[PDB]
Structure formats: C-alpha cells, structure tokens
From a paper:
Tumor-suppressor let-7 pre-microRNAs (miRNAs) are regulated by terminal uridylyltransferases TUT7 and TUT4 that either promote let-7 maturation by adding a single uridine nucleotide to the pre-miRNA 3′ end or mark them for degradation by the addition of multiple uridines. Oligo-uridylation is increased in cells by enhanced TUT7/4 expression and especially by the RNA-binding pluripotency factor LIN28A. TUT4 and TUT7 are multidomain enzymes whose specific targeting of RNAs makes use of three zinc fingers, combined with two copies of a nucleotidyltransferase domain (NTD), one inactive in the N-terminal half of the polypeptide (pseudo-NTD) and one active in the C-terminal half. Our structures reveal that pre-miRNAs engage the enzymes in fundamentally different ways depending on the presence of LIN28A, which clamps them onto the TUTs to enable processive 3′ oligo-uridylation.
To visualize the TUT7 apo state we initially isolated the enzyme bound with UTPαS alone but found that modification with NHS-polyethyleneglycol4 (NHS-PEG4)39 was needed to avert excessive sticking of particles to the air–water interface where they are prone to denaturation. The TUT7 structure in an apo state at 4.03 Å revealed an overall ‘C-shape’ conformation composed of two right-handed conformers distinct from the ‘L-shape’ of human Dicer, which in addition remains similar in its conformation throughout its activity cycle. This difference suits Dicer’s role as a ‘tape-measure’ protein capable of recognizing the length associated with a correctly generated pre-miRNA, hence its need for a fixed dimension, whereas the TUTs need to be able to function in two different modes (mono- and oligo-uridylation) and, further, to be able to act processively on a bound pre-miRNA substrate under the influence of LIN28A. In both the apo state and the binary TUT7 complex the two NTDs maintain the distinctive ‘C-shape’, apparently due to their direct interaction with one another. By contrast, in the apo state no obvious density was resolved for the backbone link connecting the LIM and CM, with only a small region of the linking density visible associated with the LIM. Nevertheless, for maintenance of the distinctive ‘C-shape’ structure, the two NTDs of the enzyme must still be interacting directly in the apo state, albeit relatively weakly. After binding to pre-let-7g/LIN28A, the zinc finger in the TUT7 LIM was observed with good density, whereas it was unobserved in TUT7 apo or binary states because of mobility and/or disorder.
Author numbering: 293 to 512, 528 to 626, 987 to 1068, 1080 to 1093, 1111 to 1116, 1122 to 1195, 1206 to 1210, 1217 to 1273, ...
Write the structure that this text describes.
C-alpha cells in the first residue's frame, strides 16, 4: 500500500484527468464542422491514449477518419490536408505521409496540442477499445501504465523518432505482466481450452472485435467457421485485494531477472511462452506482439542494440553557397565544349555497320542451334544517344513463341575479339521513346552526351557499384529538360506487358518557347538538381508533366521511374554511400562549371582528379 499510494500521486501529477477528456472532445467537435463541407459522408473515430487515458496529460490527440469503400485512403488524406490548411483554428500544418502510418500533423491554436489525423487505421482504433475496456474493469491497470510510461520518459525511451519504443508498446508490457502472474488478474483470450487448439497454428486465430465486455475471436461477411468468446475479466469473487504498488515493483523484477527478453515473445493472447522460432524472428532484440495485429513486430521500431540494453538497464535501476554570375564568353565556351562532347564521342557509320554485322553474326550462330531466332539491338546504340566503347544490348526472341544459351556461345571461337566491345520488349519501347525525344532538338542530344561524359569521368554509372545506370541519367536529363519554367520538349505520353516529330509543333502550344543556350541549360541542370529539386519529396518521372511525390508510390527510400515501367524502381539498390558520392560529384561539377575564369578545355573542365 505504501508504494501503491506513490503511483497514485504520479497519476495525479502526469495522468489525463476528466477536464482533459472533454477538452479533447471539443477538438473532435471543431474537426466535425471542418470536414463536413467537403466530406459530409465521412466520420471520425477517436482513438489512442485519449480514450484509453493511458497516456500523459499533454499527450497528442490521435484521431482517425473512416470513409466508405468507394473512396481511397490517399484521396481522403489529400482532401483532409486541404481542409486543415485553410482553417484559422490550426497552425503548423505538415504532411508527413512517408511514415509507417500516413497522418496529418497539426497543432491546435487554442490548446496547443498536436493532433495526429490518421485515416483508415482500423487496427489502431480497435486496439484502443481493448486498452480502454481493460482500464475501466481493472482500476489498478491505469496507475501501472502511467507510472511505467513516466519512468521511460525520464530515461528517454518513449521517443519513436529517436529509436525508442513507441508509446503503445508500453501498455502491452503492463498487461502481459499481470497475465503471467501465477495468480492471474486477467484471462487469456486464446488457450488450449479451445477445441483443436495448438501452438502450431496460433497465427490463424484473430480477435475480430470486443462487444458487451466480451472479446470475440475467429479462426480460419459471416462464414461458418469455428468461433468463440472469452470474457475480459477473470470471474473471481474472493481474490485478495493486493496493493497496486506490489504489481509495479514485481513488474520490474519479472522483466529484469525472471522473464528472458532476448529469446522470448510477449503475447497477451496465450499463457504459454512463445519463442522466436515459432514466429521466425531474430533473437537479437526485444519482440512484442499486438493482440489485434498478429503481424506487429517491435523489432522494426527497435533496430539499435545499445538502446535494447538501455531498456533493460533503466528497468533494473528502478527495481550550397552562392556562385559568381555567368558571363557571355564563358557561356559561349560552355556551348563549344558541349558541342565538342557530342561530336567526339558519336559513333560513326563504320561503327554502326560493324554493330549491324555483329548482330547478323550472332543471329546466324544462334539460328544454327535455335532456328527461327530473332535478335534486336537496344540500349545506347539505338536510343538516339550514341556512345563509343559502349555495351551492346540485344534482346533475344524466338519466332512462333540462359544456361543453355551460354553453352552455345562457347563453341564460336571469336567470343568480341574483332570489335573489342530474353524478350526485353520494354527496353526496345523505351529505346524508341528516347530516340523520339532526341530527334526533337539538337540541344537534347548535346546535353545527353554531356551527361554521359560527365558520369563517365566521375566514375559513376556502373550497376555493380550500386550507382544509377546510364538509362536512369538519360531519363533524368529529360526530366530537367521538361521541368524548367520554359519548356524545351513535351512529354510524349500525354500528347504491352500490362503497361501503356514533324507535326509536334502543331499540337504543342509551347513549341520553341525556350531560347537559352546549351551551356546555360547544362549549368541550369546542375543548379536545379543541387539547389532546387528535392529528392526526398519528389520522383523523377517523364510520364506526365505534373509533380509526383514519393508518398503515392510509397518509395520512401535518388528515386527515378521508368516511363512505362511504373512499379519498377531503378534506384532500388541505391545505397546512401553512393548517393553521397553522386551528390558530391554533382556539387563539384557545379563548382567547376559555375565559376567563370578568364584565360586557359576538355582536359580542364572534365578532370577526374578535380571532379573527385
């Protein structure tokens, strides 16, 4: 009772009392009239630590929105974002949709509390009911959670951004502790009592919802399958009224000396200990399971090791500068150098006929063993952007329709000594797209050749290195050419495999608008990609001229997109180290090409040592 009184004082100091309960309800009341004008059919379901009243007094307001099946979740939050920004009652509106749960962050003007406006998060909403139901039935639970959470805040363990445990995980720890007690105060919703139960198929069972102080679970629209119900409270009429202080102290003991937090899983659904082997999870760090969410893993939130030992430690104790202005003559020098980069590296007719001869030889040789084959070159060779000593990409195809193919090539003596250099349809299609984009204007080919030489001199463009491929840069340069304020060329898609020049001026209204020199565009590309364009909130894509944020495709982690290959991401294997090197190279290019110098071209501007 001595310690049991101490926690109650903690509850008074940092608990959420009634006056805060209604004050937060008026938050929902004011939200109601904001979303009503544009989304009359939508409704709000209050959730989080507010209804469960397990959080602190100054806890954030967690509010969820429910919409019919016709509307899509991204469409609702986009509309909700507009409804909150144009409201004078709210400030500091932010759109952090790239988190695990897309929510809209805003601060109440009167109270100053942070409101987390989630959408379509039924898992969290139903979780609050379970937490809320237990709190009322178990008056000793609320003091335990508030005191338990308060101690973590002192140690800096409750911060999600820092890597600390999210606040909702702390509620599960307190609930599970009471269940594990040999004199349980709470019942288990899942157990061996159920007919045909077994730990092997524990994942099939799921708690649908709670109604009338009774949990409902289903095993695998109403269907005729095994179903049952379990009460939320053990029906004991003469259990000792032990002080709440003992539970708080015993909680520290169980998780510090008795319960193994490194090789066991916490689950409030069953009494038997669940090991990491059953769920096939690491034993490196703590693992916790949410009742309604049977796939919830706390390892995702807690990846760092020192923090994991820190959790066990604290519990034991309680027991781009501006650049100079450009000059006309230096702009002319930039134009000259770009044109020179086009004219030196462009394959000649003898090289194209040599490629055609190579294609014919390969076609015949493969026809010897695989008659009816049809080969077609692709890549830099025929995309309208030539390049010497470049890889020759070819697409195998058989009319009328890797290990075996390789064995055949070993037979031919020449494999290419002379030159020294399956069903890839999308590659051919984007090759034609790139050729069409190149034929529109000589500046496009000039800047693309300049980009190719720039990436070749900076030791980037290699797939094995993990950096972006040359095709990605070819798309990116077109993205810059299309994104600048004066359009130079349009997106050809707006004007197969589940994926969708003379007369262009007639249809395109802004044809010929840009009159800037080629060197000016080359420097503008660097400026745009180093100072203006943000890679963390936009996606490089030439499918349409409108913006494309990363949240829609959920590519939360440079991002470039294929014109026809939407779901495929070229920067999937892009490691942050390579991104740092890429941006360093681009900054160096801006430095060299943005500082005019009088008196002295290829050997100087594109110097590998200086640029790296």
């Amino acid at each position: 009772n001595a310690v049991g009184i101490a926690i109650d004082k903690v509850v008074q100091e940092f608990g959420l009392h009634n006056e805060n309960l209604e004050q937060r309800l008026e938050i929902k009341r004011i939200m109601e009239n904001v979303f009503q004008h544009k989304l009359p059919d939508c409704s709000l379901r209050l959730y989080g630590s507010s209804c469960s009243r397990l959080g602190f007094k100054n806890s954030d307001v967690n509010i969820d929105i429910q919409f019919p099946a016709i509307m899509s979740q991204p469409d609702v939050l986009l509309l909700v974002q507009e409804c909150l920004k144009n409201s004078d009652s709210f400030i500091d509106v932010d759109a952090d949709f790239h988190a695990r749960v897309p929510v809209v962050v805003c601060r109440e003007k009167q109270s100053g509390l942070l409101c987390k406006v989630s959408a379509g998060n039924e898992n969290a909403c139903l979780t609050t009911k379970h937490l809320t139901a237990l709190g009322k039935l178990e008056p000793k639970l609320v003091p335990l959670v508030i005191a338990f959470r308060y101690w973590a805040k002192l140690c800096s363990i409750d911060r999600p951004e820092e890597g600390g445990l999210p606040p909702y995980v702390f509620a599960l720890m307190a609930i599970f502790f009471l269940q594990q007690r040999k004199e349980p105060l709470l019942p288990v919703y899942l157990g061996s009592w159920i007919e045909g139960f077994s730990l092997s198929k524990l994942g099939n069972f799921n708690l649908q919802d709670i109604e009338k102080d009774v949990v409902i679970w289903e095993h695998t629209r109403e269907t005729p399958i095994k179903r049952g119900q379990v009460s939320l409270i053990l029906d004991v009429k003469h259990q000792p009224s032990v002080p709440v202080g003992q539970l708080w102290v015993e909680l520290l003991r169980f998780y510090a000396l008795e319960f193994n937090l490194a090789d066991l899983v916490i689950s409030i659904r069953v009494k038997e200990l669940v090991s990491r082997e059953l769920k096939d999870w690491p034993k490196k760090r703590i693992a916790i399971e949410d009742p309604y969410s049977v796939k919830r893993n706390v390892a995702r939130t807690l990846n760092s090791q020192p923090v994991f030992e820190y959790i066990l430690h604290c519990l034991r104790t309680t027991y781009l500068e501006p650049l100079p202005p450009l000059t006309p003559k230096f702009l002319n020098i930039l134009d000259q150098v770009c044109i020179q980069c086009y004219k030196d590296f462009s394959p000649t007719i003898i090289e194209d006929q040599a490629r055609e001869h190579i294609r014919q030889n390969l076609e015949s040789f493969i026809r010897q063993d695989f008659p009816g084959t049809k080969l077609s070159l692709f890549g830099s060779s025929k995309n309208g952007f030539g390049f010497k000593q470049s890889d020759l990409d070819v697409c195998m195809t058989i009319n009328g329709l890797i290990e075996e193919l390789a064995r055949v090539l070993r037979k031919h003596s020449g494999l290419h000594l002379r030159s020294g250099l399956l069903y890839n349809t999308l590659a051919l299609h984007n090759t034609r797209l790139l050729s069409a984009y190149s034929a529109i204007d000589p500046r496009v080919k000039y800047l693309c050749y300049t980009m190719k030489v720039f990436t070749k001199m900076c030791d980037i463009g290699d797939a094995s290195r993990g950096s972006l491929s040359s095709y990605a840069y070819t798309l990116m340069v077109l993205y810059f050419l299309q994104q600048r304020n004066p359009p130079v060329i349009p997106v050809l898609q707006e004007i197969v495999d589940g994926w969708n020049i003379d007369e262009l001026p007639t249809y395109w209204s802004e044809c010929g608008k840009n009159t800037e020199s080629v060197g000016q565009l080359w420097l503008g590309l660097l400026r745009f990609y180093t100072e203006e364009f943000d890679f963390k909130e936009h996606v490089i894509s030439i499918r349409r001229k409108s913006l494309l944020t990363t949240f829609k495709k959920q590519w939360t982690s440079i991002v470039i997109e294929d014109p026809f290959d939407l779901n495929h991401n070229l920067g999937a294997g892009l490691s942050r180290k390579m991104t740092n090197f890429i941006m360093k190279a681009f900054i160096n290019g801006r430095r060299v090409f943005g500082i005019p110098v009088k008196g002295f071209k290829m050997e100087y501007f594109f110097d590998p040592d200086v640029l790296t």
